[PDB]
Amino acid sequence: HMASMKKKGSVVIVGRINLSGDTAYAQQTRGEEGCQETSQTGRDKNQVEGEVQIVSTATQTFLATSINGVLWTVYHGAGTRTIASPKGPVTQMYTNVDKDLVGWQAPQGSRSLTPCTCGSSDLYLVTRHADVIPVRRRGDSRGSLLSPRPISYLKGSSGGPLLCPAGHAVGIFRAAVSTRGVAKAVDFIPVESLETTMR
Numbered sequence: 001h002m003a004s005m006k007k008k009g010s011v012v013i014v015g016r017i018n019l020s021g022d023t024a025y026a027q028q029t030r031g032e033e034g035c036q037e038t039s040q041t042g043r044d045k046n047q048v049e050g051e052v053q054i055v056s057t058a059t060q061t062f063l064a065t066s067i068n069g070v071l072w073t074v075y076h077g078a079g080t081r082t083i084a085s086p087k088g089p090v091t092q093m094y095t096n097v098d099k100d101l102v103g104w105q106a107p108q109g110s111r112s113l114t115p116c117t118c119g120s121s122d123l124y125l126v127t128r129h130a131d132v133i134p135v136r137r138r139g140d141s142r143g144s145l146l147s148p149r150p151i152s153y154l155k156g157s158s159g160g161p162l163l164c165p166a167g168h169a170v171g172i173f174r175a176a177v178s179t180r181g182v183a184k185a186v187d188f189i190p191v192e193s194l195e196t197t198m199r
């Protein structure tokens with residue numbers, strides 16, 4: 001029954017993690033009803049700001065992080081969806097299910113993190129609740145939480161950044177390594193993997 005086949009809506013920016021000042025905090029920029037409408041039309045005329053966006057579909061909410069002029073997030077949250085923009089839906093410019101990674105051109109007014117070249121293993125994970133969690137790098141795509149916490153505190157933070165001491169992007173949060181519901185480590189997409197996807 002082709003005529004009745006539905007179309008999936010767009011990912012919608014519904015807020016951000018404000019890191020401009022000395023205090024990190026989450027801001028909501030669009031409520032549920034407006035989100036639903038924006039998802040169907042793909043038309044989002046709200047001003048975008050900052051590096052870390054809170055994004056939503058009709059069924060999920062997670063994060064998206066701007067690096068090198070691309071807004072990146074996880075495939076398991078966004079799938080192949082478009083993202084809403086002032087002039088209509090924007091198609092992904094990167095999609096890699098093997099890495100759990102997608103990307104769209106960064107929205108006008110967003111700011112981009114710089115890829116980290118420090119080679120440091122003292123990292124910081126930014127969650128959708130604006131918590132800044134110290135993480136020690138343990139491999140190319142793994143880092144341990146200095147203070148483990150239940151997975152409930154990390155749920156909905158896929159697509160968020162791991163940052164170096166200087167605030168450069170080191171990776172994109174992908175999955176939690178949990179033992180009996182406690183997240184002792186995180187799996188992330190290295191920024192180097194993003195830079196390779198960009199070419």
Ligand SMILES: COc1ccc2nc(C)c(O[C@@H]3C[C@H]4C(=O)N[C@]5(C(=O)NS(=O)(=O)C6(C)CC6)C[C@H]5/C=C\CCCCC[C@H](NC(=O)OC(C)(C)C(F)(F)F)C(=O)N4C3)nc2c1
Pocket residue numbers: 060061062063075076077097098099100151152154155156157158173174175176177178186187
């Ligand atoms: C459908 O096409 C694809 C393609 C590639 C995929 N690649 C992967 C890796 C994949 O994993 C999926 C999705 C992901 C996930 O839940 N992420 C997070 C998230 O917040 N999500 S989310 O924002 O709430 C939302 C669900 C809305 C979007 C940060 C997590 C917060 C809390 C943990 C909850 C408990 C789940 C633990 C599980 N642990 C785990 O698998 O660890 C492995 C890898 C064994 C290792 F080795 F690390 F131990 C886990 O984290 N996850 C299972 N799904 C894929 C799907």
Ligand SMILES: [Zn+2]
Pocket residue numbers: 115116117118119164165166167168
């Ligand atoms: Zn750095």
